[PDB]
Amino acid sequence: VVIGIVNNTVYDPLQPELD
Amino acid sequence: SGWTFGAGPALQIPFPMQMAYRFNGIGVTQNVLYENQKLIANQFNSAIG
Ligand SMILES: *[C@@H]1O[C@H](CO)[C@@H](O)[C@H](O)[C@H]1NC(C)=O
């Protein structure tokens, strides 16, 4: 429903620490 | 520019993002405007008419 949105990646403060 | 033209140098900013700013300034989250943008636009146009 959001117009003008672009695809990108977000960081997670839990995945690198758990893995 | 929004409100920056009255407090210093003018800064360009899209009008939907300015509306999201003004909605977040009163307590309403920006998602209701970023999702139901067409409805708000139609209501504003009907009010102006
Ligand atoms: C971006 O601007 C162009 C030119 O005004 C317009 O044709 C297009 O619909 C705009 N796109 C969005 C997502 O507002």
Ligand SMILES: *[C@@H]1O[C@H](CO)[C@@H](O)[C@H](O)[C@H]1NC(C)=O
């Ligand atoms: C974003 O990703 C989806 C799925 O990969 C794709 O359908 C869409 O065209 C992409 N949009 C952009 C901004 O490139």
